[PDB]
Write a protein that binds this ligand. Structure first.
Ligand SMILES: CCc1c(C(=O)n2ccc3ccc(S(=O)(=O)NC)cc32)[nH]c(C)c1C(C)=O
Ligand code: NI
Length: 127
């Protein structure tokens, strides 16, 4: 069994910019989630080899994780907040699709998503 290459965090051909909203997403949203007690399972891509989950990348075809997101933010990879938010949302949805309701990983994702949504609710208006 084999892990795919992680999602790209650099691409010179991709259009990108810095925006106060993206700055907020790194400085407030990502930092708050990263430090959370339940962050660790989401801080790097799922290692399906180590975890013996040969089915994972056969069903999750758009994997995403906060390590990848943190890197994209730090490299100013995104064009807008909406792209970054989509990545977070893909991360959560993937978790809910693959795992059973009530699994620890799901409970952990739900807690993080609740905090995520609280912070997104106060996304500053774009300057
Ligand atoms: C349930 C597996 C999983 C994790 C996960 O990372 N883990 C959950 C238990 C667990 C134990 C050790 C290690 S580890 O040894 O690889 N250390 C980081 C990782 C672990 N994250 C996500 C998003 C998922 C799924 C399938 O949704
Ligand atoms: Ni726009």
């Amino acid at each position: 069994s084999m892990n795919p290459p992680p999602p790209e965090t650099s691409n010179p051909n991709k259009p990108k910019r810095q925006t106060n909203q993206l700055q907020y997403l790194l400085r407030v949203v990502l930092k708050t989630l990263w430090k959370h007690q339940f962050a660790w399972p989401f801080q790097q891509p799922v290692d399906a080899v180590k975890l013996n989950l040969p089915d994972y990348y056969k069903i999750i075809k758009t994997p995403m994780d906060m390590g990848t997101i943190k890197k994209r933010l730090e490299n100013n990879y995104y064009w807008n907040a909406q792209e970054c938010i989509q990545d977070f949302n893909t991360m959560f949805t993937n978790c809910y699709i693959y795992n059973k309701p009530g699994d620890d990983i799901v409970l952990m994702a739900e807690a993080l998503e609740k905090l995520f949504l609280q912070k997104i609710n106060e996304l500053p208006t774009e300057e």
